[PDB]
Design an enzyme around this catalytic site. Structure first.
Site, PDB file in Angstrom:
ATOM      1  N   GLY A  98      15.481   6.044 -60.463  1.00 42.83           N
ATOM      2  CA  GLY A  98      15.556   7.224 -60.217  1.00 42.83           C
ATOM      3  C   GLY A  98      16.730   7.736 -60.503  1.00 42.83           C
ATOM      4  CD  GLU A  99      20.211   6.740 -66.084  1.00 41.23           C
ATOM      5  OE1 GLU A  99      19.916   5.583 -66.566  1.00 41.23           O
ATOM      6  OE2 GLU A  99      20.625   7.491 -66.895  1.00 41.23           O
TER       7      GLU A  99
END
Ligand SMILES: [Ca+2]
Ligand SMILES: [Ca+2]
Length: 191
Positions: A98-99
């Site tokens: 996600g990051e």
């Protein structure tokens, strides 16, 4: 237990709780090598490694993780002058973290490897062009295929993502429309 068969499966289980713990356990046990290429191959071969953990590990900023990630991408062959298919092959293997910082390292190396496998290639002036396109595709497939986005990105919108300040290192709009159609009709998946 004792049999190497069992040891590998135990390492795999441990990796799924904490990747570096799984790797070290297998290395302690003499079942896995110590170079980046050894780990990368392991990552490629073991389908039962958890998809999300492989993504988080490959995208991590630590020096050793990055070397593993480079070797992992280098073990792909991206020939064929087909950008989206190359990207689909890459992202079949694991789940993108996600990051944004992680997606960014993954997309940069994907782009460098893509061009290296397509050197007579014509559309992409530089790795940056490929990197921006790849990133835009991740954003598009997230926008088009996530029910939490209610105003979907439009083809006109998508084309904007791929402009400036290169302006000649910039892609024909007909090419961006075709990619838009491809991603709208068929989401990026692992399946
Ligand atoms: Ca892969
Ligand atoms: Ca994915």
């Amino acid at each position: 237990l004792k049999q190497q068969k069992e040891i590998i499966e135990q390492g795999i289980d441990l990796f799924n709780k904490k990747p570096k713990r799984g790797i070290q356990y297998l290395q302690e046990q003499g079942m896995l090598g110590t170079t980046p290429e050894d780990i990368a191959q392991f990552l490629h071969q073991e389908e039962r490694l958890d998809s999300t953990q492989v993504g988080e590990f490959l995208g991590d900023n630590d020096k050793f993780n990055k070397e593993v990630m480079y070797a992992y991408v280098d073990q792909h062959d991206f020939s064929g002058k087909d950008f989206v298919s190359a990207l689909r092959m890459f992202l079949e293997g694991f789940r993108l973290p996600g990051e944004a910082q992680k997606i960014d390292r993954l997309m940069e190396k994907f782009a460098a490897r893509y061009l290296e496998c397509n050197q007579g290639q014509t559309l992409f002036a530089s790795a940056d062009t490929a990197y921006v396109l790849a990133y835009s595709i991740i954003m598009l497939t997230t926008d088009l295929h996530s029910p939490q986005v209610k105003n979907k990105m439009t083809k006109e919108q998508y084309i904007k993502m791929n402009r400036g300040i290169n302006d000649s290192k910039d892609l024909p709009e007909e090419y961006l429309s075709a990619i838009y159609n491809e991603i709208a009709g068929k989401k990026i998946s692992m399946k």
